[PDB]
Design a protein that fits this description.
Radius of gyration: 15 Å
Largest sheet: 6 strands, mixed
Order of helices and strands: EEEEEEEEEEE
Number of strands: 11
CATH architecture: Sandwich
Oligomer: monomer
Number of helices: 0
CATH topology: Mutm (Fpg) Protein, Chain: A, domain 2
Strand order of the largest sheet: 4-3-6-1-11-10
Protein name: Ostreolysin A6
Shape: globular
Structural class: mainly beta
Pfam family, one: Aegerolysin
GO biological process, one term: symbiont-mediated hemolysis of host erythrocyte
Strand content: over 45%
Distance between the termini: 45 Å
Subunit structure: Monomer.
Bound molecules: sodium ion
Keywords: Cytolysis, Hemolysis
Length: 137
Protein backbone atom coordinates (compact mmCIF):
# COMPACT_ATOMS: atom_id res chain seq x y z
CA UNK A 1 0.00 0.00 0.00
CA UNK A 2 2.50 2.63 -1.15
CA UNK A 3 3.54 4.51 -4.28
CA UNK A 4 4.43 2.26 -7.19
CA UNK A 5 7.29 2.95 -9.56
CA UNK A 6 9.93 1.31 -11.71
CA UNK A 7 13.16 2.53 -13.24
CA UNK A 8 14.51 0.46 -16.13
CA UNK A 9 18.11 1.11 -17.12
CA UNK A 10 19.21 -0.41 -20.41
CA UNK A 11 22.99 -0.67 -20.49
CA UNK A 12 24.53 -1.73 -23.78
CA UNK A 13 27.63 -3.59 -22.64
CA UNK A 14 28.40 -5.00 -26.09
CA UNK A 15 29.77 -3.48 -29.26
CA UNK A 16 26.60 -3.32 -31.37
CA UNK A 17 23.69 -0.89 -31.22
CA UNK A 18 20.35 -1.96 -29.74
CA UNK A 19 17.04 -0.12 -30.27
CA UNK A 20 13.91 0.39 -28.16
CA UNK A 21 10.47 -0.07 -29.71
CA UNK A 22 6.86 -0.23 -28.65
CA UNK A 23 7.24 1.39 -25.25
CA UNK A 24 3.80 1.60 -23.64
CA UNK A 25 2.60 2.00 -20.07
CA UNK A 26 -0.83 0.38 -19.76
CA UNK A 27 -1.20 1.59 -16.17
CA UNK A 28 0.50 4.63 -14.77
CA UNK A 29 2.67 6.85 -16.89
CA UNK A 30 6.21 7.43 -18.10
CA UNK A 31 7.91 10.29 -16.31
CA UNK A 32 11.10 12.32 -16.27
CA UNK A 33 14.18 11.25 -14.34
CA UNK A 34 13.76 12.03 -10.66
CA UNK A 35 10.18 13.41 -10.88
CA UNK A 36 7.43 10.76 -10.63
CA UNK A 37 4.70 13.33 -11.35
CA UNK A 38 6.30 14.84 -14.49
CA UNK A 39 4.83 12.88 -17.36
CA UNK A 40 6.82 12.41 -20.58
CA UNK A 41 5.84 11.07 -23.98
CA UNK A 42 6.83 7.60 -25.08
CA UNK A 43 8.11 9.29 -28.22
CA UNK A 44 11.07 10.50 -26.13
CA UNK A 45 12.22 6.88 -26.28
CA UNK A 46 10.43 5.26 -29.22
CA UNK A 47 12.96 4.10 -31.81
CA UNK A 48 15.96 5.36 -29.80
CA UNK A 49 19.30 3.63 -30.20
CA UNK A 50 21.40 2.68 -27.19
CA UNK A 51 24.99 2.76 -28.42
CA UNK A 52 27.85 0.70 -26.98
CA UNK A 53 28.60 1.65 -23.37
CA UNK A 54 25.54 3.91 -23.16
CA UNK A 55 22.63 3.70 -20.79
CA UNK A 56 19.02 4.65 -21.45
CA UNK A 57 16.79 5.17 -18.41
CA UNK A 58 13.00 4.70 -18.51
CA UNK A 59 10.92 5.73 -15.48
CA UNK A 60 7.26 4.84 -14.86
CA UNK A 61 4.99 5.51 -11.89
CA UNK A 62 1.44 4.95 -10.81
CA UNK A 63 -1.16 7.47 -9.86
CA UNK A 64 -0.25 7.38 -6.17
CA UNK A 65 -3.32 9.31 -4.99
CA UNK A 66 -5.69 6.85 -6.73
CA UNK A 67 -4.22 3.61 -5.44
CA UNK A 68 -2.90 2.75 -8.89
CA UNK A 69 0.18 0.87 -9.86
CA UNK A 70 2.20 0.84 -13.03
CA UNK A 71 2.31 -1.76 -15.78
CA UNK A 72 3.92 -1.67 -19.19
CA UNK A 73 5.90 -3.27 -21.97
CA UNK A 74 8.61 -2.55 -24.48
CA UNK A 75 10.79 -4.37 -26.98
CA UNK A 76 14.44 -4.29 -27.79
CA UNK A 77 15.17 -4.81 -31.47
CA UNK A 78 18.32 -5.17 -33.56
CA UNK A 79 18.75 -2.22 -35.95
CA UNK A 80 21.42 -4.05 -37.96
CA UNK A 81 19.06 -7.02 -38.55
CA UNK A 82 15.91 -5.38 -39.88
CA UNK A 83 14.72 -4.48 -36.37
CA UNK A 84 14.37 -8.17 -35.56
CA UNK A 85 13.13 -8.58 -31.99
CA UNK A 86 15.77 -9.12 -29.35
CA UNK A 87 13.44 -9.56 -26.36
CA UNK A 88 10.05 -8.43 -25.11
CA UNK A 89 9.79 -6.87 -21.65
CA UNK A 90 6.88 -6.60 -19.21
CA UNK A 91 6.66 -4.81 -15.87
CA UNK A 92 3.92 -4.83 -13.27
CA UNK A 93 4.09 -2.98 -9.95
CA UNK A 94 0.56 -3.19 -8.54
CA UNK A 95 -0.58 -0.97 -5.69
CA UNK A 96 -0.89 -2.56 -2.27
CA UNK A 97 0.71 -5.67 -0.83
CA UNK A 98 0.46 -7.41 -4.19
CA UNK A 99 3.52 -9.18 -5.71
CA UNK A 100 5.31 -7.54 -8.62
CA UNK A 101 6.27 -9.03 -11.97
CA UNK A 102 9.24 -8.44 -14.28
CA UNK A 103 9.32 -10.71 -17.33
CA UNK A 104 11.81 -10.88 -20.20
CA UNK A 105 10.58 -13.07 -23.05
CA UNK A 106 11.29 -14.02 -26.61
CA UNK A 107 14.44 -15.49 -28.08
CA UNK A 108 17.22 -14.21 -30.29
CA UNK A 109 20.43 -16.19 -29.94
CA UNK A 110 22.54 -13.39 -31.42
CA UNK A 111 21.93 -11.50 -28.16
CA UNK A 112 22.59 -12.09 -24.50
CA UNK A 113 20.45 -10.21 -21.98
CA UNK A 114 21.03 -10.08 -18.20
CA UNK A 115 18.89 -8.25 -15.66
CA UNK A 116 18.87 -7.62 -11.92
CA UNK A 117 17.46 -5.34 -9.23
CA UNK A 118 13.77 -6.20 -9.45
CA UNK A 119 11.82 -6.35 -6.22
CA UNK A 120 9.32 -9.19 -6.63
CA UNK A 121 7.86 -8.94 -3.13
CA UNK A 122 5.60 -6.17 -1.84
CA UNK A 123 6.55 -2.58 -2.42
CA UNK A 124 7.54 -0.95 -5.62
CA UNK A 125 9.16 -3.01 -8.36
CA UNK A 126 12.08 -0.61 -8.19
CA UNK A 127 15.28 -0.17 -10.19
CA UNK A 128 16.04 -2.84 -12.77
CA UNK A 129 19.23 -2.86 -14.86
CA UNK A 130 19.21 -4.70 -18.19
CA UNK A 131 22.62 -5.41 -19.73
CA UNK A 132 22.60 -6.11 -23.48
CA UNK A 133 25.33 -7.75 -25.54
CA UNK A 134 25.30 -8.90 -29.14
CA UNK A 135 27.31 -12.12 -29.14
CA UNK A 136 26.48 -13.51 -32.59
CA UNK A 137 25.73 -17.15 -33.27
NA1 LIG B 1 3.83 -3.44 -5.81
Amino acid sequence: AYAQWVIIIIHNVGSQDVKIKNLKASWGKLHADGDKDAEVSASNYEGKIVKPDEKLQINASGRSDAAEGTTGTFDLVDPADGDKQVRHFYWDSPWGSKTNTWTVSGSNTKWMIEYSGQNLDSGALGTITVDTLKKGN
